[PDB]
Every structure is written in structure tokens, then in C-alpha cells.
């Protein structure tokens, strides 16, 4: 009705928060663990590597200042769990802002 896969997570064993935060036992990383977990991410245990349990997108090399939700959208706009969670205008927001930054830097050729 809204697809096969999209409808179905890439890793159901990580659909519940509780399941995800656990993976963050030893989080020696700047980014907050509760937040990542909330944004759908979990830790692979290969450093600061994380993967959204639904679209299966993976992020790494997090900066201290970064927001889980923003980079999830900055990189994986298509995730359905993201759309249910943060809505349409949010996703497009992040992307427009980037698109604007690009065009404003294009004046520099």
C-alpha cells in the first residue's frame, strides 16, 4: 500500500529502543547514546559506527556537535521510520538548507 521493504525494517531485532540503547553499552563517543537510539540508530561495535534499524543507513565519524536526527535526514531522507517520526517538512527542511548553502557558495563559482 506503501511497499514491501519500506514497510518492513532492515533489522527487526532492533525495532525497539530498549534493544538499541543496549548496543550502546560502552559509548566513549561525543555524540549522545540515548539520542542516537531514539533516532533509530544502534551500534555495530566497530567504533562510533551506527545503523538505522529500518532503512539500514550507516553513519560514522560523528562530530561532537552533531544531532542524530539531522544527519539521519541529511543522509537518509528516504527512511520511513524517519518520516513517521519527524515528518515531511523536517526532512525537506534539512535538504533545502543544504541546497541553499550550495547555491550561495556557487556565487564563488
Amino acid at each position: 500500500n506503501f511497499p514491501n521493504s519500506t514497510n518492513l525494517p532492515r533489522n527487526p531485532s532492533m525495532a525497539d529502543y530498549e534493544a538499541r540503547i543496549f548496543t550502546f553499552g560502552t559509548w566513549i563517543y561525543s555524540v549522545n547514546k540515548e539520542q542516537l537510539a531514539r533516532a533509530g540508530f544502534y551500534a555495530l561495535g566497530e567504533g562510533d559506527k551506527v545503523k538505522c534499524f529500518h532503512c539500514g543507513g550507516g553513519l560514522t565519524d560523528w562530530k561532537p556537535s552533531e544531532d542524530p536526527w539531522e544527519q539521519h535526514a541529511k543522509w537518509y531522507p528516504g527512511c520511513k521510520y524517519l518520516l513517521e517520526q519527524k515528518g515531511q517538512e523536517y526532512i525537506n527542511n534539512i535538504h533545502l538548507t543544504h541546497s541553499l548553502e550550495e547555491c550561495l557558495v556557487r556565487t564563488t563559482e
Partner: peptide
């Protein structure tokens, strides 16, 4: 962040 960076994707992988």
C-alpha cells in the same frame, strides 16, 4: 557524520 559520514555514511558507510
Amino acid at each position: 557524520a559520514v555514511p558507510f
